[PDB]
Design an enzyme around this catalytic site. Structure first.
Site, PDB file in Angstrom:
ATOM      1  N   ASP A  25     -44.772  -3.715 -43.811  1.00 15.53           N
ATOM      2  CA  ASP A  25     -45.517  -3.172 -42.659  1.00 15.53           C
ATOM      3  C   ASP A  25     -45.147  -3.846 -41.339  1.00 15.53           C
ATOM      4  O   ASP A  25     -46.017  -4.400 -40.652  1.00 15.53           O
ATOM      5  CB  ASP A  25     -47.023  -3.317 -42.908  1.00 15.53           C
ATOM      6  CG  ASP A  25     -47.881  -2.513 -41.922  1.00 15.53           C
ATOM      7  OD1 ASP A  25     -47.407  -1.493 -41.386  1.00 15.53           O
ATOM      8  OD2 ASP A  25     -49.055  -2.900 -41.703  1.00 15.53           O
ATOM      9  N   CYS A  26     -43.863  -3.797 -40.989  1.00 16.23           N
ATOM     10  CA  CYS A  26     -43.429  -4.230 -39.668  1.00 16.23           C
ATOM     11  C   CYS A  26     -42.353  -3.298 -39.100  1.00 16.23           C
ATOM     12  O   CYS A  26     -41.778  -2.473 -39.821  1.00 16.23           O
ATOM     13  CB  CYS A  26     -42.978  -5.699 -39.666  1.00 16.23           C
ATOM     14  SG  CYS A  26     -41.471  -6.035 -40.584  1.00 16.23           S
ATOM     15  N   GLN A  27     -42.090  -3.433 -37.807  1.00 20.42           N
ATOM     16  CA  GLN A  27     -41.099  -2.584 -37.123  1.00 20.42           C
ATOM     17  C   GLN A  27     -39.754  -2.683 -37.795  1.00 20.42           C
ATOM     18  O   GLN A  27     -39.008  -1.700 -37.863  1.00 20.42           O
ATOM     19  CB  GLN A  27     -41.011  -3.036 -35.661  1.00 20.42           C
ATOM     20  CG  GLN A  27     -40.029  -2.251 -34.747  1.00 20.42           C
ATOM     21  CD  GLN A  27     -39.880  -2.913 -33.373  1.00 20.42           C
ATOM     22  OE1 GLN A  27     -38.787  -2.999 -32.814  1.00 20.42           O
ATOM     23  NE2 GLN A  27     -40.980  -3.388 -32.839  1.00 20.42           N
ATOM     24  N   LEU A  28     -39.444  -3.871 -38.317  1.00 21.54           N
ATOM     25  CA  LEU A  28     -38.117  -4.109 -38.888  1.00 21.54           C
ATOM     26  C   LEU A  28     -37.923  -3.641 -40.336  1.00 21.54           C
ATOM     27  O   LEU A  28     -36.802  -3.648 -40.828  1.00 21.54           O
ATOM     28  CB  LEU A  28     -37.741  -5.599 -38.729  1.00 21.54           C
ATOM     29  CG  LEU A  28     -37.535  -6.117 -37.299  1.00 21.54           C
ATOM     30  CD1 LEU A  28     -37.229  -7.619 -37.344  1.00 21.54           C
ATOM     31  CD2 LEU A  28     -36.383  -5.402 -36.604  1.00 21.54           C
TER      32      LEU A  28
END
Length: 171
Positions: A40-43
């Protein structure tokens, strides 16, 4: 008395996503790209797609991605370890190992991962730091999350080539 130090990343035992003990000795003689991961992160997307590409091209005989989930960077790995592995398999179809979630920062750091940090002198500051481990279990390179595959892939290929050259040449 001088307390002994662990020499190789491959010396450690870790828990897999289903909570079972895995010895990292099974990766001895292979190249490993060890990465702290998060769902659950942009990356997340670019990393899973990129690591899949690398694992497919170079693995699994002489190379593996080794993925360690961690919830210490923007709380970006909330789900239980089993669900993390499902996420990765369902969304990306990856075949590389996803180990149990671990701590990397703080008093309770996972020893296998602390070995990477101590060797490189670089503790992760976010999700998706990456550590290249040679067949003898030594860290030879690291990359920040900002760095792209175009500059990681050639380091991998070289070590994988030499692994293959060495296996062919030697008895």
């Amino acid at each position: 008395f001088l307390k002994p130090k662990i020499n190789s990343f491959y010396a450690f035992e870790v828990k897999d996503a289903k909570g079972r003990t895995v010895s990292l000795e099974k990766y001895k003689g292979k190249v490993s790209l060890v990465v702290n991961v998060a769902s659950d992160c942009q990356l997340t997307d670019r990393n899973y797609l990129g690591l899949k590409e690398l694992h497919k091209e170079f693995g699994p005989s002489h190379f593996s991605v080794l993925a360690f989930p961690c919830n210490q960077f923007g709380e970006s790995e909330p789900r239980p370890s089993k669900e993390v592995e499902s996420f990765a398999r369902k969304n990306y179809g990856v075949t590389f190992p996803i180990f149990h979630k671990i701590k990397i920062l703080g008093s309770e750091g996972e020893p296998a991962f602390r070995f990477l940090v101590d060797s490189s002198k670089k503790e992760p500051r976010w999700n998706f730091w990456k550590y290249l481990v040679n067949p003898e279990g030594q860290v030879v390179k690291f990359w920040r999350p900002e760095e792209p595959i175009e500059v990681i892939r050639p380091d991998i290929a070289a070590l994988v080539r030499q692994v293959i050259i060495k296996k062919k040449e030697d008895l």
